[model samples]
Target chain A: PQITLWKRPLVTIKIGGQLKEALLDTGADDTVIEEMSLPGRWKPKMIGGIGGFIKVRQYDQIIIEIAGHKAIGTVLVGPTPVNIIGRNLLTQIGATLNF
Target chain B: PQITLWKRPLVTIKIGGQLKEALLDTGADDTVIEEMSLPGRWKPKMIGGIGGFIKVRQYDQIIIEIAGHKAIGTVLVGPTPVNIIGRNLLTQIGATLNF
Candidate 1:
């Protein structure tokens, strides 16, 4: 499915059996989710972006559903200001950028 | 022109007669540049993103060239971790998100 780029390209996604909206952030390297619960052992990591860096828990082999397309990859759970679906997951789902 | 989305959609952008690579950040509402000298009067404002907020100078009617496409819009200059091309300029260049 094709998605239109809005002022902010927001899309509905399902992760860990819960549905939420996330910003399609090509600038980000990994998919980041606002503080969420995942029953698994995770490695502590830090991600830096436009503003600054944030401490996060990196969980691997997580399933992410975006507009019916699914991707399994690493997910970073942290105190992110917004839920972001980055290229790490986007490419896995065959998302492309077009004009 | 069709551009493929990389892990990080970094693109060459020409602004103020200088060529620089910028991240195409869909999560950002306004285009932000690292501290640069831009001629013309600007309004002082603050913009907040994932990590925090920063003081910025907004210059209107600035010309931004991205991948040979020109967009005239507001450009913000300030202390930024990275130069970002936001939706404010992307829309003017007919950018769309696809899969």
Candidate 2:
């Protein structure tokens, strides 16, 4: 089973008990979430993309649910313009780039 | 059958007789390539994504080949950090987000 990738292929995802829409970004190296408070300690890190880089707090052990498939992985909390679900969790949900 | 999405999902793409590696970016709305000298007329345009927005030259009638599948669509050439195959071209190739 699969879903069509629309112009903006967004999906609902629950992270830290909060539901949010995130872009299925294969271009991103890691999952990045907007600034939020969650349980556990985080380490400061920097991530770069199309525009530039931003400082983020790397939080591990974060549980994520995408369209019903669930996976626990690392999530970065930062001042991102958008929420992006990268390959870290995409792989866990068995998501693939196919034709 | 489909190809698995790797951490950095890169594949060979032939654009304007130039073979290059492009990322399968589900996040980007338009396909963007690094600054290149392509044969075609272009219009000034802007595209936004994870990091921020960048100015691009929207080139239409550009042919792209990914994994033997061919697609002719808009290709933006600019100072992109990487070459990304967005939905604009992916849909033409019958590619989808599958699990």
Candidate 3:
């Protein structure tokens, strides 16, 4: 291994009406969430991406809960799926990821 | 029901040195996953994001396993954590979600 050093924080998030643990990725510029993990009951609103500035169509919304902190963001579905946590939430906390 | 229309796919993803189920969210602009779900055994590398040209830092690498398929991409860790699967992987597959 190259022996890199990063001091980042990992947290758990809740989506799909379920609570799951996750790691906050700062290398990533936006907030991402897994679409399938949703409970199929709570309705999510489709809005924006990567800071909620980019306009995305054909998606939906769900509430995201992380470490007791929460936010509602856009979740995009594709060929493969993984819930993502992005910058929209990062900016709100005045924090950044270190690698 | 508001009777919204969407034709998207749902798939499970593995991260944090573990495997967990997730949904593909098309409404989302980037791919996302749960970070806390990782195994903590895999070594991740720091990289860029949102097209990989943003020149951002403080992230790492991990192999994302989705539906028996895999992609070694940058994973960001933050204060409130969630694994984010972004466009870097979506573009690789010629598929999109309709919501």
Candidate 4:
């Protein structure tokens, strides 16, 4: 699929057996999801962005379905305005930036 | 050119006769650059991200050469850790996300 950048690259994703919309973020280093309930152990982590850094729960070996494409990687759960699918999982899905 | 997610899609950009490297961010709504001197009239604005909001100077109709392709948009100058080329400018370059 090819998505033009005329708007936010929002896509449906399935995580933890729940369907949600997330931004396909090429700028983000890691995928951060809005705080949610997951059946797993996580470690406390801090991530930086445009504003600054925030504390988040790092859940490793998480499975996510991006636009129906499945990928597994570490996921960060925290208080974010929206869910983000970053390079960590984008790589697994063979996502690319083309001009 | 097509860029894989295995690495950060950092590209060379030229602005105000100065060259800089910036991230091609599909998730960002607007282009935000690190603090730099630009000769123009701008308004003080604030932008939000994963953590919180930060103050920035919005310079409208600024010209930026992204990987040698020219684009004009509202470039935000602020105290960001890295320069980012968001959807605002990516749209002008016919940039797309492919899988």
Candidate 5:
């Protein structure tokens, strides 16, 4: 699918057995999702952005279904305003930026 | 041109008569540049993200040449780690997210 920038490029993604919407963020290096519970071990990590930095739980080898595409990678659960699908998962799903 | 997510999609842009690199940010609503000087009057504004918000100078109708594509819009000058070319300018360049 090709998404235009006229509006936010929000898409449905399946995570933790639930369907949710996430933004395809080309600027973010790692995927950041809403704080949720996953049946796995995770590490505490900190990531910085526009304002400052926030601590997050990093879970590796997570399977996320994005827009009918399956992707497996590391996911960070934290306090982001919206769910963001970053380059880590985007590369696995073969997503790209075109002009 | 199509850009992959293997690395940061950094590109050269022309702003304030100088060449600089910027990120193509699809998740951001407005263009944010590092603290710099621009001509004309500007208004004080604040924008928010993960951690908090920062005060910025909003300059409208600013001409920015991004990756050879020309765009005119409101630009925010603030203390950002990196320069970001957001949806406001990406849409003008006909940029799209494809998989």
Candidate 6:
């Protein structure tokens, strides 16, 4: 038997002056904002992980209102062309991904 | 009851190097490598995860054989535009993710 994982749609913000959509992934234990299109403060850093290291930078915090609820989170203040929504944040709100 | 999605063909290296292939996702729990290409020294990092820190790094020492297969791990260098291949590594070795 397998467990069912769901997907949800999260808001897209502009980075490096570009906008891109992100997939809310529940299986992921952490939030990962890829530099698909990082904005304003363009410098990214090198942090370590089990797979090696990734350049993660901070961007702007996005505020969105969904289903009558509003929330704000600090986004990587750059351009994450491939932003991923991990359980780190998603689980808190009990989101379900449908894709 | 909906299951059974399998794809194989793992082992394609190139980034600063360039080598592209398909999915070998055993519901990957970890491991990723994607740099656009793999060639020489091309440093990348800025670690943060869990919706916060990111930009981690380290260099190459990849050795893949199979069954009678062997894999080597190493330390830091640079150059990885985008690469990912996770738990497939550990699991392939009877290992589990616990940290």
Q: Kindly list the per-residue Cα lDDT of model 2 for residues B52-81, writing each as its tens digit.
A: 887889899887898678988889998888
Deviation in Å, model 4, residue A58 alpha carbon: 0.8
Q: After superposition, how far is residue A21 of candidate 1 from its true place, in Å?
A: 0.9
Candidate 5 lDDT by residue in tens digits, B53-99 = 88999999999999999989989999988899999999999999999
Residue ranges of candidate 4 with Cα displaced over 4 Å: none
User: Candidate 5, clashing residue pairs?
Assistant: none
**Which lDDT tens digits does candidate 2 get at residues A10-69?**
899998889999998888889999988989989999888777778999999889898778
Residue pairs of candidate 2 with colliding backbone atoms: none
Instruction: Between candidates 1 and 6, name the one with more favorable TM-score.
Output: 1
Across all models, the iRMS values in order are 1.7, 1.5, 17.3, 0.7, 0.7, 12.5
| Candidate 6 per-residue C-alpha lDDT over B4-37 given as tens digits, one digit per residue, 9 for 90 to 100 | 1111223454333234442222223334454333
Give lDDT per model, in order: 0.84, 0.86, 0.42, 0.93, 0.93, 0.39
TM-score of chain B of each: 0.92, 0.91, 0.48, 0.97, 0.96, 0.26
**Cα distance off (Å), candidate 1, residue B34:** 0.5
What shift in Å separates residue A6 of candidate 2 from its native position after superposition? 3.3
| Candidate 4 C-alpha lDDT tens digits along B1-99 | 998988899999999789999999999999999999887899999999977999999999999999979999999999988999999999999899998
lDDT of 6 by residue, A28-61 (tens): 4444666444334544555433334556765445
Tens digits of per-residue lDDT for model 5 on A1-99?
Answer: 999999999999998899999999999999999989876999999998899999999999998999999998899999988899999999999999999
Least accurate 10 contiguous residues by lDDT in model 3 chain B = B1-10
Candidate 4 per-residue lDDT, tens place, A13-97, comes to: 9988999999999999899999898778999999998788899999999888999899988999998888999999999888999
Candidate 6's TM-score: 0.32
